[PDB]
């Protein structure tokens, strides 16, 4: 079996990471924990076994044959590197290395076989970009894809603990102590980073990270540039608006398709249905579609509302919803993990392909 | 001066009527308040005057010049041939008349024109419709309209009192009382007309209203056929999706459209800006966007996230935000009363044609 190593092990991504791999089929025979030197010394479970918490260094990876990042950019930046020098393949977590040439950007369902060249360094997509990818994949191998119109309605979790507990906290003033949501107070939502913070409670908020010069967010631009590189395609039209609403967790999306030929819809939601990772939930008759509340804790994605445009002859509109801390990270993560040893593809780098920054 | 009628004037749907005529710049000499037998004898305020509710019955019209409906639909139905025949001017706010030929269908920005032919009756549109066509025509008006595919953030008070109290309620039961939003008990959302009922908190319905035959339910149809009525116009493909989350007032709505020629972004900023009832909220650099929290309580449509689409050389996306009490109702109604007074139509019908 592997040692695996979990980077950012501390926090509630990391612990998201930890559970995923707890109900892993990866064979393990050794865990090892890193997270920042505050954090060395304590203790976490992985199944029945007490961890101890190691600080992450460029020297911390020696005989490690997977490593699991679970941090930030920063973290990824810096210490991905030395982890691929030291013979070790990295499923990183962040955007950082996702649209650079040489790591595969995958979501297994999809483009499995984009691992089998890898240089050390997987990317797991964003979360919004994930569930996308799963819906729509059935449907593109049977009648292609032409362009992409897509509505989010983003989950809060996506942003972090802090922003839900911003949510509820803000909540509770409203509900509770009678504050108008005008009056709160925000400090987190939309974006951590940015300038401005505004509430999110009883309200949407038509901005996911930072705004890029074209006027689209970095989350919008994501779902554009991440879409092109998994489905292999950039011919691919896609445009999307990314909206945070009042909900913890799971995203839904409102996405429109145009198909390069004509997909009769009992054949799109049969296809959709046979799909692996996929599930379908129409049935309009009984008031079944996909709802965010109901996806929470499942590692699946959910389709629904599927049916045509009423002037474009190719053009298919349906709904998705996933929950955004599994298949929308951890799970998407841990999955690449399995399907890295499922293919063969768990071995040392001899070329590096990444530079050492420190 | 005018006599103007409020019917249904008891509940919320008619509260929020009163508010907007109170502040109306119509020359009001009487008001009169009608509602059910049940309400008939009660007082409500009209500015500080407190009006005696009278039963809504088929001779109650008698003298009146204008009257609001703000009821259920069945009311409408009964009730509007009758004042209609009493001589009365009526603006109805249920779905009833939107789609009948004789009957105006009218967001007063966009097509007051079509309220000089009117028979007794014109019908306010959809709520989820007017903020959407008040974003619009500015941008039709100067380089025409080829699609339209829109995706709806609505708010549960667009559903009625009842929905906007089971939020709350629901809402509470997950933050102070620990049930998963899972386990929650609900009895009117995703609609009130059907079998099923979801839970709305931390959750996002992609249905309202009842489904119709095409599998796209009656909401996202009345945004269809709707559009084409008011911009006068069924070459203009629409297709929406209608999703309810968890805010109680004022709808929000991601809308691409594909105009005939191309328009320049900030030509379409100005222009929309420039455009009666629109506010341009639209500075990026500064994170200045709609939002439903801020459009509460006015009867601005505001418009923001205004750009290019990535491929199509004629897309152009944008968010739209207004109040569905006040802009998508109340005074979407009584803006239509205002119009027909500034345009000489406040008269009695001759042709009875209900």
């Given at each position: 079996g592997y040692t695996v190593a979990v980077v950012g092990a501390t926090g509630a991504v990391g612990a998201q990471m930890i559970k995923m791999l707890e109900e892993s089929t990866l064979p393990i025979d050794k865990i090892r924990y890193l997270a920042s030197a505050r954090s060395a010394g304590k203790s976490l479970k992985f199944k029945d076994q007490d961890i101890t918490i190691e600080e992450t260094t460029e020297?911390?990876?020696?005989?490690?044959?997977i490593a699991l990042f679970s941090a930030g950019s920063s973290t990824s930046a810096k210490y991905a590197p030395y982890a691929v020098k030291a013979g070790v393949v990295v499923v990183d977590?962040?955007?950082?290395?996702?649209?650079?040439?040489?790591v595969p950007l995958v979501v297994p369902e999809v483009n499995?076989?984009?691992?089998?060249?890898?240089?050390?360094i997987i990317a797991c997509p964003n979360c919004s970009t994930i569930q996308m990818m799963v819906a729509l994949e059935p449907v593109r191998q049977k009648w292609g894809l032409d362009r992409i119109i897509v509505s989010t309605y983003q989950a809060v979790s996506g942003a972090g603990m802090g922003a839900i507990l911003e949510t509820q906290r803000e909540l509770r003033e409203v509900?509770?102590?009678?504050?108008?949501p005008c009056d709160l107070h925000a400090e987190?939502?939309?974006?951590?980073?940015?300038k401005k913070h505004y509430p999110i409670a009883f309200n949407a908020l038509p901005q996911i990270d930072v705004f890029t010069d074209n006027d689209y967010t970095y989350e919008e631009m994501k779902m554009t540039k991440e879409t092109k590189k998994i489905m292999e395609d950039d011919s691919i039209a896609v445009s999307a608006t990314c909206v945070r609403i009042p909900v913890l967790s799971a995203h839904s999306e409102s996405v429109y398709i145009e198909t390069k030929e004509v997909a009769p819809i009992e054949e799109v939601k049969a296809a959709i249905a046979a799909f692996p990772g996929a599930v379908l939930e129409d049935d309009v008759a009984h008031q079944i579609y996909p709802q965010a509340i109901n996806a929470v804790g499942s590692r699946d994605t959910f389709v629904g509302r599927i049916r045509k445009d009423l002037?474009?002859?190719?053009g298919i509109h349906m709904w998705v919803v996933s929950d955004n801390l599994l298949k929308g990270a951890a799970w998407n993560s841990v999955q690449i993990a399995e399907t890295l040893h499922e293919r063969g593809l768990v071995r040392p780098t001899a070329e590096l392909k990444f530079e050492l920054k420190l």
């Open positions: 020297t911390a990876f020696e005989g490690v044959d977590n962040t955007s950082y290395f996702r649209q650079n040439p040489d499995a076989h984009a691992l089998d060249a890898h240089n050390g509900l509770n102590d009678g504050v108008k987190i939502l939309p974006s951590g980073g940015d002037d474009a002859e190719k």
